[PDB]
Symmetry: D3
Subunit: 305 residues, 6 copies
């Protein structure tokens, strides 16, 4: 007899809701995320059923982060194709991404681990605190110290690597602590990504020529370069202007060589990879079998450094 009779969710409607998310999963991609899980599973040996739920959760949370990273940054290309919101609009894309956050949270509930929810929130909370500080610096025009940048990347990479490995740990019968190691793989990953954005014919095709400058981000070398001579304000002022122009991007890229900021970056990645390899050997000299996979993942992720 009711005026309003409540109706069910149709598959047709979910097709709309996931429009921008589905679109992005159609674009060919790195799947670096999967080689890291595969390599850490050589030690944790998470049961196939649980590991598949962990893998779909991370697959989702990944593409959802891109949806919202590319809005917050205003990128123009994503994996060489148009960004999702340049097709669906900032509005529909940022709501697809937010939606997936909770479909992932529904998926995590399938592991029926009681610590799974606390792990998820504590990873997601970490993430938003990384992008919290990053935006604050970017928006306030005050460049962070290299230490601050790193602390910020520990949180940021706390929402994928740390979340996936913590979830695998929570499902594995062993209680080695891998999080300090994976946090370091994250830091090595981002500093590399920051370098490749400014110096790679593979990355000027996929994201854009020096796409980090267009968005204003204080990336790892951009920091070192602004600080190295601070009486020069050419570099920080270029970040302010947020240039889509390429002559400006080229000049900034060239000032950054003249501060030898790309050597600097390359030798820190050298120092951090030594810490990784020694940390892995530490894990193996205590009971864990030789991991070829994760040494190869580490060589892969520095291959242009």
């Amino acid at each position: 007899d009711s005026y309003y009779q409540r109706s069910d969710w149709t598959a047709d409607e979910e097709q709309i809701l996931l429009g921008p998310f589905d679109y992005l999963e159609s674009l060919p991609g790195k799947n670096m995320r999967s080689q890291l899980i595969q390599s850490f599973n050589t030690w944790l040996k998470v049961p196939t059923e649980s590991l598949d739920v962990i893998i779909k959760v991370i697959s989702m949370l990944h593409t959802a982060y891109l949806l919202i990273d590319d809005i917050q940054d205003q990128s123009i290309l994503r994996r060489g194709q148009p960004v999702a919101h340049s097709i669906f609009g900032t509005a529909q894309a940022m709501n697809s991404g937010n939606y997936v956050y909770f479909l992932a949270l529904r998926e995590v509930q399938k592991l029926q681990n009681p610590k799974a929810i606390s792990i998820y929130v504590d990873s997601l909370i970490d993430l938003h605190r990384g992008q919290g500080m990053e935006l604050f610096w970017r928006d306030s025009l005050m460049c962070p110290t290299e230490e601050q940048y790193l602390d910020m990347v520990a949180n940021k990479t706390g929402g994928l690597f740390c979340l996936a490995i913590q979830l695998m740990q929570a499902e594995a019968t062993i209680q080695v602590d891998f999080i300090p190691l994976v946090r370091l793989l994250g830091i090595i990953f981002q500093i590399c990504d920051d370098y490749l954005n400014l110096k790679s014919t593979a990355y000027t095709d996929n994201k854009g020529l020096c796409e980090d400058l267009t968005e204003g981000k204080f990336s790892f070398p951009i920091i070192h370069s602004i600080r190295s001579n601070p009486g020069n304000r050419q570099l920080i002022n270029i970040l302010k202007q947020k240039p889509r122009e390429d002559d400006i991007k080229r000049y900034a890229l060239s000032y950054m060589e003249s501060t030898n900021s790309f050597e600097y970056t390359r030798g820190v990645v050298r120092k951090l990879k030594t810490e990784a390899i020694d940390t892995i050997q530490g894990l193996e000299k205590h009971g864990l079998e030789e991991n070829i996979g994760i040494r190869k993942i580490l060589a892969r992720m520095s291959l242009e450094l």
Copy 2:
């Protein structure tokens, strides 16, 4: 070691919560605070649990408003600038999402496992609400009025239904208030749709006829566009997004000529009836008489 991990300092939390702490220092309605206090007359959650439910709802509330004003591209919010006009869409969006998960770290404090599924399922239905509202907005499809109401059931289901579902989850009473509270959410949304165009308390707060500037197929607007399809003026006006008052004013006039405002007042009437019967429905079945919920039902249709 090259990298020594740092602890999250209280000044950084201040930065993250900046947009959020702003929207909270603005004065608002808190009709939701009395919606909880009325339902708590029947459910009787202890004040230790009720406060957690109340902090969750007030966070999740201010978190949507952070994001909704970006999605809508609102110009104002409770008379004052939208938070993202001070901090930038970038920081507002992030601060908004950050809360979503602090609200979750807060829900776990109830230590109730039925609570985590109630939060996922509520947040999921909220996004299928906005998802379909934005889809019509952007495609310029006009939904049917049944279609609009289903979408409102989900949106008015990530706050109203969340709060009452978490209360039902901390009480032992086996009685479903979810229909009543969802019907209340819809009556609330339909009034917010009318008052957008028709209240000098709402035009002094969100701007003149802001549902037009946003392109939203709101309840009266749907009625007016569908009441005469040969006139494609109102829908064309929604496609342009008019910050100009002389268009907004003209559109409000067209919607009068289609008795969309009489029509709207009339659905709300027919609905409050269903509401005050469903209330007496639960009262006949063992519950004490709830004066307060009757008063919420009539403060939330006080115009019209």
Copy 3:
């Protein structure tokens, strides 16, 4: 056959005529309706033909306004939004042109062949009017006042001269009213140029001093710029196209300091004289006294 041709449905005609049907549901002057009724006192066209002439003039009228508001980029029109702000320049332009030819399919109904040449020649002179107005606007050449008046003769010749020429073409009287009606068109244009800046009935309708926002070398503006060439303020103000009222206001002040408004009032006076003599001119020569045309001549200079 793959393609079976369809018939033009009445709902599609509704779409085409959308912008047009809008500008017509807005209230207007219809000084042109009384301009026809006054001249019909002398010409005495039967109401069967007069109605066709009247439908043609009211269509061609609303069709220019559709297009003129795009060319000028007007913001308002008779108090209400320009049609193209609801439908988009694209649809408004097309709907405007579409009428131009429906007005022609209407002219053929008189079944008068002198009528088709009167319509071509009128529409041609209208476009040489706007053509030269836009040319000065864009080049920032300021026309001489003789130059401005020649251009107005053509523009005020695709409506006034059209309507009277079609009436003269359905009457047997061999007397030329075209000079009188063209002089009337110019007196009308010059007043519309003054009232743009000086009427609270015209600022409440087209916006404050809208001839400035449009860059138009209007009659008083020409006088003021040419009255002192060492001051390039007024012309520079036309180059910027000021939606800002504080510039518009400043410019209106400058034009007072140059007695462009006294000057303008004075041309209109001198012209109405020529008009009311040319009227008595045709009356001495066999025509009955026309009270109504005297009243149009003075309603159309009622300010000043």
Copy 4:
């Protein structure tokens, strides 16, 4: 003694009025319009004097339509050069084009046929009803069915082909009906043009890379592709955004192959050309001499299909 003495139109002034029209006639061009008249005149044999007035009228009405098409569409190139209004301004160009409509109408009056005026209005009225429906769809974002699109192109091509052939018929001593045939040549012309806009190095040079997407137009394959999978809304949403960007245009062009919409388009043009050739043979098996010219015009107009 008069205050205002009325002055004549100078050649100098007409030079201004026709600025955008004259400009466009200076750009080298297809003159496909003239091979169609030439080929249909093999049957109608319109007297040279009349045919020259018909030819100048169509020459004018053509360039005038471009003036206003390129404003309504906001094209950036026209026959490889800048659009007229990118030189003279939307205002001066749309008034030049409107002006020519009536100079053509003055020219038609030179044939001193009484049916010439009714033909002209009935063609022009048809035209504006084609662009009427096209804009309405484009502006309302609701994609037409293939049948609707075609009915719309029957009107659109009713203002050049149909007008020129009807005018020739009205001047010829024979009363064969050629309009059903020419209407079909029009439909074949537009569907081809729609295809070439998205798939031709000759058309990405002359109009722009996928210039139809920039303007949002529901062109013949863009329709078929939106409808073929309607749970995907990537294509229609690209039309909404009206991208000038090329990566977006490339993605849309590529989605359209994956719906096999270019085969679809190519095989309809095949089916319609069969109807043409059979209609021509119908006209010849009834008294008309073999028309090589119009078979060659038809092969020419599909040469990339």
Copy 5:
């Protein structure tokens, strides 16, 4: 010869000086005219020299205003449009700079060589004033209040210090008024900073709270931002450059809650004290009592 050089005609000088002659036909304060007349009570420059000093100061004055309204992107100036909104930043900038050097060709008329070094050194310090104001504006560094005051000493040193230094250079009295006049320049700047936000005579002239739209770290704004760094609202509001009044209004409210306006009034008080003591300081040392300078000191803090 192909090229025969031409002479600079008086109509061309009219063009160059167009923006300049405009800002001069607008009515202004001329507190600087009475600042000179007060100091001339002690210095007694002959009216033949005083007039040259006065023409230099009134040119250099109107020349900064031409350029400052471009650098700030002011919308208004003394109630009326900024000169560059009529002529374009291009012509305004150039006309502004042109004067800078006509002011110099005017200084040489004093035939005093100490005068040319006083003009260079004054103009140099003006640019180190604006240079550092713009640097903070753009970098979003907030200066310390000592930092702000040093910058004001230079800016209020290319007009105040210029005028008095040129007067001291045409008088034989060996007494330094430069400290007093610089202190007066700062008291003047601090009041202009308060009145921007707090005067209906200043909001009716430059627009509501125009120091916000310009992003300027002005004296009260510095105090408010630095009085609470955990709240990044006011500084974020400066980063956006708000032409919207509802943000400007909100920011003005925040600055009340930080007693930046009480604080500001209090620095001015403490300063006028230093001023009226330094005045009595020079008077004890052989100078006649200067009523007029006491009155300037109190007209230039008449609000507060």
Copy 6:
């Protein structure tokens, strides 16, 4: 005891003030300005100490003019790199440039000549009257006559060439008058620059493809071309639109050939170089030694004409 204690200017602050000026001096450049001083010093033989102050003054006044030319014009490239204000903002760059005007004026005071100040003002005043008339024409859309343009360039080049040579004269013990000659070298310089902007692969790399059209400037051939056929208004209307688009710039460049405006320009430069060489020979047939340097500077400055 004072509330405000006044503080000194630090080197740190001057580094900020000169940010845009220092930036521009870092970009590799022509230093044509120095070959002209060097060649005229073969006759004037200005003492090394004075000549160095004259040379630093002109070095400064030069880079300062660029700071403000590139704002007033809204250039996008300067010597092939980004314009200064595209890095520091119209505001900070136009104040750096204005600042340098007076640091130069401080430098001129080091020659301790009493006529040095009057020379400086009279040069700077001339300059601003050249850019005064140029902007007025550009902004008012009314094209100057070739004579007007030239008078305007006599002032414009009165603020570098004339200033540097007048300063050298004021320091030299001889009183030959070189200003009529140098004024003519200026005119030859600008007409050449105007030509090269529209027709040079060296100048389409350094400033931009036909950068003069983007800014609307009535340059020497653009004048001749607008006037040559004045019933065509295509060219002047392109200046109005201020096109950054390249197809528009190409069309305008091509209309300018069809008016044979580049021959015209090239043969005036021929006629003016004859006046130069005959004026120099005049100076030498009166007491001055053969100047190879200034003949080579003149051949250099027409090398593409």
